[PDB]
Design a protein around this ligand. Structure first.
Ligand code: F43
Ligand SMILES: C[C@@H](OP(=O)(O)O)[C@H](NC(=O)CCCCCCS)C(=O)O
Ligand SMILES: O=S(=O)(O)CCS
Ligand SMILES: O=S(=O)(O)CCS
Ligand SMILES: [K+]
Ligand SMILES: [Mg+2]
Lengths: 260, 549, 442, 549, 111
């Protein structure tokens, strides 16, 4: 039986990357954000309102027999024909506990029927609206994958991942969708991810301390763990590069035996 | 001692290494003198020209300026300009740089001179050539030479139009009128003059600089045709031939097909365009348009002036307008030619290579490529980690990826003198950067970089090519920002390491040394600054034919 | 035989057909079914008689939004489909028993025109089928209704469109699976200029057959391009066999093992199977214990990674019943595979690269569109050498109706016409039949 | 009685029927105020910019003005201008006419609105559309709407850029903000408004008028792309969507391929060019760009204003520059729009047809075509015979052949309402003219005219097409002057005889009725005169970004 | 060299560029194997054979040639057999008048 190894590297950053990919690694629960509060921050619909459909349920439709196609179990939202909605995060380069390609690889290892996009300033996940809500609540917001000060939910005007932090250690947001509450020491969402004002502000808890962030981050930084210190990871990157180069030149055993 | 420190202190008030700052204190767009000028200008044109139909409105979308809007320092200069002054639409120097490239065509004269002597029995001497040169300088800008009752182009509209001559034959060069000569021996240092003359032989060429106004009204495909028509007219007049006989067709075939050298080739399918358009210019030809090799002995400086021209042309004008449009790609390009950031990384790479391998002293191997690209990539990203203001400056991942990979690619070329080894180094820098910060560029930035390693040394029909012969029509490179201009710089680095006078076309190298050009191709970053500050005198305006203002 | 490789042929239901079949039996250079598919794709034309009738009646000639007043003709073309069909056949036919074939479908509203293959034999390329069909139709209509000589140009415009002003059939009522040569993005690319939605509509949305049709045409194009030549030939043959034709039941086996799985669990199944079949070997363990792997057979590892890619698309796009997920699936299946093993991904990074540009150009303002409008000829999706387009076809078959530019919107005409040809509708079944026919002749 | 008599009286001192004149006594070029201005301009402003390199020299070739150099009267106007003022390079009105055509693209909005409602579940109302219209008028000229730290295009450089909306749905039209609406009911006479609305149905369209400066820096191929980028940006902002999601790609596919209508299609092979270039514009579309049909009920006047635009665009700009260059083809084109010559011949033909057959009352036959074309050709050539000053005016045979054949072709269309019957009449006029005077045009003038009769009614693949669907890429028509503009006039005559509101594309007809356009498409001969006299205010100048005069 | 690609390769191809593309690939591999050319120099071999392809969609500056022009140069649909230079017909028939006439008429009428 093949035992997956997930990711190479001998530093704690590479171990944090392995833990995220590993479906058997239980992510630490840090907070309890109610379903109703999260739906409101997402800003696609109000809680209790019937899910909008893109197509009729699969059971109703009479599709021709296709053995291979029907071998795969569809997710609950696909069965009910629910529309496809999104959740987008900007992750601070200053030790945020989740990073763009780290997220996408983790999503593809742990979740079913995922459309995910990785960019320097934003990381998006497009999924059947109902399934997207359960995942966002139990994995993306309640666990150590989320830090209310250094990870921001934003669908437009994403600028901030590469910027200096503010006085309270909060990441920049041109629309100020979240604010620091001095009295409680908690981060509060005053707007939805697209910038619409909320009727009721949503408390997302207190920011994680710098010592905890440095321990669990998936980013290499000279002022944290430099990538220069992970010789093992550099060996695998260079190997993939060389294997790609030689295969492109001549995909034959003799070439790989002599030059790899 | 970092080359970018001066720019950071001019741009940021706080310590360049400080991680914390203050936001939402700048009054939005009102913080910028340029944005205030735009609002005031809008109010005027809406009432006077648009009949009350609104246009520019800073309140519709994003409230710009929640963060401090930063100015930019042109690398290697002391000019500090606002970002908006670097957009191609607002910068007459960038527009003239493209106009001067677009309106250039080179025509071999030896074929035409053979038709005259061997088919027509008419003698060709330096005196007849000098008479021909005076004729084409009247005909090319739109003056008439044969027919009665001809109308003509207003001279004030075509003052930038010239026909020049150059030759590899030193004996002929000495006899030609210096007013029309592009003097290879005077314009280039001795060693460079000898490499160019040996490459071109004893051949004679005409450079047609078609009026800027022509390319503006029409397109790039017009240029070789305009030049050919007037070359034909000038031969008929200067040599008293029948004004339309069998031998005239040979001159047209030579000037339009057999002896013509343009800047770019026609593009097919979705990119359907005529010759002399930016997408048709291969990377080796772009190197040869740039003239820093003639005035500086610094191989790094030579390569980075090519990166500047490449980013301005390929990203701002070509991808940002011809292939897209709107607000465009100013800052995707400025990251490669501002605040001395790429300069610092490329100079670090040069010194690392000079000490470890020496310059142009190593045959390319995978071990050599991997060593150099890794070291330069790690140094570059460590700079963004150490200086929070540097990361806030190159805020977009695509800008950071292009800068780190360009320095890596250039450094590999300094050691090997092979452009494909250099591009292979660029691709390793890209996949390493991705694992360093767990991000790279925009959504579709790394299509060519993931394809990269496999196609870099490929021998297959649509994958193979020396980097010099690749360009914006090379399949993997046809769509995305933050690559094309940097590839041109990597191409230059291979030739700068070898101390080559040219990269791919010596005719182009000689043609763009002409002192009669409007844009200064030897100092592009300086020229860009002059355009940004509205100090650049461009050609193509229509003042004389418009109502007084 | 140039190679000693053997393959086991399995059908679309995962049933064994035959073990120990030579690899070259599925080659475009030897397989009789592949030869017939190229011959038929080049000579078959889809005619929209209802379209011609509507264009003439309204004067809607010359392309989108065009209408020419005073140049209308009211002709009962559809009602006289049989008479028109018989005149077209008489004009095209060379010998009484040649392969000229005409068929009326959807009560004479559309026509399946198969030009005799002799006309393609004495032609340089394939435009002849469209040009000859257009001429036969013009003459047939003019003769049937005694059209006035001053109105003949109107008949031409309703059939071919704004040709020759445009070097394409702009606003015409005749169509082919192949785009005009004027639209090729590279030399030898004609068999790559086939829309994803056309493959899907022609196979009646049957997943394994849409995958097979796309892999056959893409890999045949690799021979035309010069990519599947010399030392590169075996890579493309193994690619066709394993990714496109379910060889050794590899595609179906990986799907079955991951029925309730993820892209990540598909990657783990691929590595496990490659190790079992001795396609890859352990190289060395690093400081953390991470073990790098190496191919024991470079081209065969590439084919196994390619089959796993199709399985990953079936599992992930099938769980969502949405085609948009395909670009992200192609990207991250290859990205995860490389960092799980240190091995090169599908097509040495070119499948991952294609997926990067494809994701961007299927989620941005700059170009592209939905997955169904892409082709192997497209500026965005040409980069992988036959390994990216077959998975996109699989995703479109799993889509339950989330796309605007679906095959029902873009490919109704070509879909109905080309599905009437057996080798186009069920390619897997007929290519397997062809391999068994030639296996002992090579 | 003769419409050209007034012009001949203004142009020639002697009686128009006189046999003799005097030559070689005008002092050459010195007789002309324009030539004197050119010599003076060469000495002053030109010389200081060239560093002693000569340019304009009237003494090098032909001594112009051995005969009297004549001015020109714009047909139907009282403006008398010098010939040089009609060259496209010296005339800002001709340049703006082309700029306005080049920068236009039309995009269907119903598909995008369906993606919003059915895929995204976002409601579309007249209020949301009005909000969208304000957004695109900020975004299209180069203003930013989503990202922080964006640079922008100076509003003073893009004041001519507008995004407008039109609809066949009268209920929606009543609810849309009039500032952005192209009001079909107000701009067109009632009967014409009904024909257009019936043709387009209940569909809604947006017209993008990209800045003039964009097409000047770049090309025609840029226009549809620039429009598509900013349409996408405006939808994201106005409807608060994820700034880059799956549904955004549908808007791009619709705006670039599925619901886009440009002015011209891309050109292949030797003519390799992008969309929205003059060669890609079919004759029916050129008719629909011209707007005389909305302000005049005269079918002859409607056709001749199309001939004027056609000659200016196809002969002066397209064949004279894009396809050749230099001094060019001003007078090959002016013969079709000056001195009321073509007007006299076309009005004679109209009256002959009106009395004998009636207007649009005869099915085309060879007898009808032959009768009309013969009569109009004989009348036309008899005018050149009777008036020696008229022959001295249209001194080139090509000019005479195009004028006589255009009047013949137009007259056939007045009787039949069939454009191919009209073009067949043009070809008979050509071969008859050849036998009348034992000459026709220049060396290669009649390639298409000898091919003409056989291809006029042909049904073969590359020979067939209604004249509306033919254009500068139609094989026989791809090379020569004195045809394309006249063919556009013949196309218009078929629709003018029928009282049609449009010839081929009602979307183009509506788009060019926009009052916000710079050039007046309803009065082209008058606009040309205004440009000739330097009274026309053009867009595209760069004053604000250049050093103060 | 006179290279006649097996007709089977044209039978399973859409058009005729396959002959030039397959010959170019066989030549590149044959030269690289014969002289053991270094992997960093392979792109140079490609450029000497096909020219500035794929930057230009033609064999610009190449050393392989056909009587037929590239499909990218066709001026109309179905024109490939018409894109043969007059001088090519003359040189191929060794300037024999009636044979040059016959060759040109056969190809033109087949087109
Ligand atoms: C709507 C898109 C999706 C798309 O197809 N293009 C956009 C927008 C487009 C518009 C924005 C104009 C406007 O605001 O009205 C323009 C200027 C192109 C145009 N149409 O003229 C552009 N981007 Ni974008 N775009 C940029 C970039 C970026 C960076 C910004 C990262 C950050 O942290 O701020 C990210 C990609 C990434 O994450 O890597 C990005 C995405 C995006 N880019 C997201 C919007 C993100 C947002 O909501 O803020 N661009 C850059 O990384 C730098 C250059 C910058 C370009 C302008 C210039 O070069 O001056 C601009 C290039
Ligand atoms: C892909 C293609 O678009 P289409 O899919 O054909 O609509 C192509 N555009 C581009 O490649 C846009 C390039 C410039 C903008 C993106 C820079 S990252 C073009 O318009 O021909
Ligand atoms: O967000 S995207 O990567 O699609 C565009 C960057 S300009
Ligand atoms: O003399 S020619 O007829 O060849 C050219 C006319 S401008
Ligand atoms: K232009
Ligand atoms: Mg292990």
């Amino acid at each position: 039986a093949y035992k997956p190894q997930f990711y190479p590297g001998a530093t704690k950053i590479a171990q944090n990357r392995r833990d995220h990919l590993n479906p058997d690694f239980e992510l630490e629960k840090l907070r309890e954000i109610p379903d109703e509060e999260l739906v409101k921050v997402m800003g696609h619909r109000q809680p209790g309102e019937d899910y909008k459909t893109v197509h009729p349920p699969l059971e109703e439709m009479d599709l021709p027999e296709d053995y291979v196609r029907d071998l795969v179990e569809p997710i609950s939202g696909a069965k009910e024909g629910h529309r496809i909605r999104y959740i987008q995060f900007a992750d601070s380069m200053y030790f945020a506990p989740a990073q763009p390609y780290d997220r996408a690889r983790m999503y593809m290892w742990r979740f079913r029927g995922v459309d995910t996009g990785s960019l320097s300033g934003r990381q998006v996940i497009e999924m059947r609206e109902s399934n997207l809500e359960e995942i966002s609540k139990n994995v993306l917001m309640d666990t150590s994958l989320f830090d209310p000060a250094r990870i921001g939910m934003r669908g437009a005007t994403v600028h901030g991942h590469s910027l200096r932090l503010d006085e309270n250690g909060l990441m920049f947001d041109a629309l100020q969708r979240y604010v620091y509450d001095e009295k409680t020491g908690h981060v509060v969402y005053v707007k939805d991810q697209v910038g619409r004002p909320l009727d009721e502000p949503v408390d997302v808890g207190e920011p994680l301390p710098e010592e905890k962030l440095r321990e669990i981050t998936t980013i290499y930084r000279k002022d944290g763990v430099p990538m220069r210190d992970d010789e093992e990871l550099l060996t695998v990157v260079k190997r993939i590069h060389r294997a790609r180069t030689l295969g492109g030149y001549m995909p034959v055993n003799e070439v790989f035996d002599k030059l790899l | 001692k970092k080359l970018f420190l001066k720019a950071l202190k001019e741009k940021f008030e706080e310590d360049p290494k400080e991680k914390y700052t203050k936001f939402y204190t700048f009054g939005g767009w009102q913080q910028s003198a340029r944005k205030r000028e735009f609002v005031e200008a809008n109010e005027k044109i809406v009432a006077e020209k648009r009949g009350g139909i609104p246009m520019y409105n800073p309140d519709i979308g994003v409230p710009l300026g929640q963060r401090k809007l930063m100015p930019y320092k042109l690398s290697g200069t002391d000019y500090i300009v606002e970002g908006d002054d670097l957009h191609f639409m607002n910068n007459a120097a960038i527009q003239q740089m493209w106009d001067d490239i677009r309106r250039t065509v080179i025509v071999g004269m030896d074929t035409g001179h053979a038709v005259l002597e061997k088919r027509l029995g008419v003698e060709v001497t330096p005196e007849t050539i000098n008479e021909y040169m005076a004729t084409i300088n009247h005909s090319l800008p739109g003056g008439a030479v044969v027919q009665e009752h001809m109308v003509e182009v207003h001279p004030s509209l075509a003052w930038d139009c010239y026909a020049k001559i150059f030759t590899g034959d030193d004996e002929l060069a000495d006899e030609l009128d210096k007013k029309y000569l592009i003097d290879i021996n005077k314009l280039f240092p001795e060693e460079q003059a000898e490499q160019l003359k040996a490459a071109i032989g004893k051949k004679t060429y005409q450079v047609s600089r078609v009026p800027t106004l022509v390319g503006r009204v029409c397109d790039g495909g017009t240029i070789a045709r305009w030049s050919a028509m007037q070359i034909g007219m000038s031969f008929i007049t200067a040599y008293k031939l029948c004004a339309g006989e069998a031998a005239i067709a040979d001159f047209s075939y030579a000037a339009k097909h057999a002896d013509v050298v343009g800047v770019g080739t026609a593009l097919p399918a979705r990119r359907s365009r005529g010759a002399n358009e930016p997408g048709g210019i291969p990377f080796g030809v772009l190197c040869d348009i740039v003239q820093t090799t003639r005035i500086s002995d610094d191989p790094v400086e030579q390569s980075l002036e090519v990166v500047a021209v490449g980013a301005m042309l390929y990203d701002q004008v070509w991808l940002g307008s011809y292939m897209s449009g709107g607000v465009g790609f100013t800052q995707y390009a400025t990251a490669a030619y501002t605040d001395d950031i790429l300069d610092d990384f490329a100079y670090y790479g040069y010194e690392y290579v000079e000490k470890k391998y020496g310059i142009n002293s190593t045959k390319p191997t995978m071990d050599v490529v991997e060593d150099i690209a890794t070291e330069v990539t790690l140094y570059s990203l460590e700079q963004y980690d150490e200086f929070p203001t540097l990361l806030e400056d190159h805020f977009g991942g695509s800008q950071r990826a292009a800068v780190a990979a360009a320095a890596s690619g250039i450094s590999v070329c300094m050691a090997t003198g092979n452009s494909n080894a250099g591009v292979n180094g660029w691709y390793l820098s890209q996949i390493m950067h991705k694992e360093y910060h767990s991000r790279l560029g925009f959504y579709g930035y790394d299509l060519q970089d993931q394809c990269g390693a496999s196609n870099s040394l490929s021998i297959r029909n649509d994958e193979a090519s020396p980097l010099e012969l690749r360009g914006p029509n090379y399949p993997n490179y046809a769509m995305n920002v933050g690559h094309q201009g940097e590839y041109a710089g990597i191409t230059q680095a291979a030739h700068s390491a070898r101390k080559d006078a040219f990269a791919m076309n010596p005719l182009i190298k000689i043609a763009f040394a002409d002192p009669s050009l409007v844009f200064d191709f030897a100092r592009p970053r300086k020229e860009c600054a002059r355009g940004a500050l509205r100090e650049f005198e461009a050609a193509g305006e229509r003042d004389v034919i418009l109502p007084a203002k | 035989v140039k190679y000693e490789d053997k393959i086991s042929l399995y059908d679309a239901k995962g049933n064994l057909v035959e073990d120990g079949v030579p690899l070259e039996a599925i080659s475009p250079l030897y397989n009789p079914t592949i030869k017939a598919m190229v011959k038929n794709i080049k000579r078959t034309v889809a005619v929209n008689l209802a379209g011609i009738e509507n264009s003439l009646k309204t004067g809607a000639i010359g392309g989108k939004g065009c209408k020419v007043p005073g140049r209308t003709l009211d002709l009962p073309i559809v009602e006289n489909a049989e008479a028109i069909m018989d005149e077209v056949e008489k004009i095209l036919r060379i010998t009484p028993d040649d392969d000229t074939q005409l068929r009326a479908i959807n009560d004479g509203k559309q026509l399946v025109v198969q030009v005799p293959s002799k006309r393609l034999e004495v032609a340089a390329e394939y435009s002849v089928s469209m040009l000859n069909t257009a001429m036969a139709l013009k003459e047939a209509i003019i003769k049937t209704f005694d059209v006035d000589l001053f109105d003949g140009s109107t008949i031409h415009a309703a059939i071919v469109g704004r040709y020759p002003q445009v070097m394409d059939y702009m606003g015409g009522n005749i169509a082919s699976l192949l785009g005009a040569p004027s639209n090729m993005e590279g030399l030898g690319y004609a068999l790559r200029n086939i829309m994803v939605n056309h493959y899907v509509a022609t196979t009646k949305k049957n997943l394994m057959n849409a995958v097979a049709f796309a892999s056959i045409m893409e890999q045949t194009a690799m021979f035309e391009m010069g990519d599947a030549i010399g030392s590169f030939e075996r890579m493309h043959l193994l690619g066709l066999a394993y990714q496109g034709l379910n060889s050794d039941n590899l595609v179906i086996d990986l799907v079955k093992a991951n029925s309730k799985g993820t892209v990540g669990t598909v990657v783990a199944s691929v590595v496990e199977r490659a190790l079992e079949d001795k396609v890859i070997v352990e190289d060395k363990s690093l400081e953390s214990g991470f073990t790098m792997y190496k191919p024991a057979d470079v081209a065969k590892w590439n084919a196994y990674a390619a089959a796993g890619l199709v399985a990953a698309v079936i599992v992930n796009c099938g769980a969502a019943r949405a085609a948009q997920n395909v670009a992200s699936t192609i990207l991250y299946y290859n990205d995860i595979l490389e960092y799980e093993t240190g091995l090169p991904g599908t097509d040495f990074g070119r499948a991952e690269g294609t997926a990067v540009g494809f994701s961007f150009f299927s989620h941005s303002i700059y170009g592209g569109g939905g997955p169904g409008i892409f082709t192997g000829n497209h500026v965005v999706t040409r980069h992988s050498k036959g390994f990216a387009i077959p998975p996109v076809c699989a995703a479109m078959c799993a889509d339950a109706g989330t796309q605007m530019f679906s095959p029902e919107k873009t490919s109704a005409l070509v879909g109905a016409v080309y599905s009437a040809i057996d080798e186009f509708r069920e390619p897997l079944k007929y290519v397997i039949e062809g391999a068994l026919e030639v296996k002992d002749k090579i």
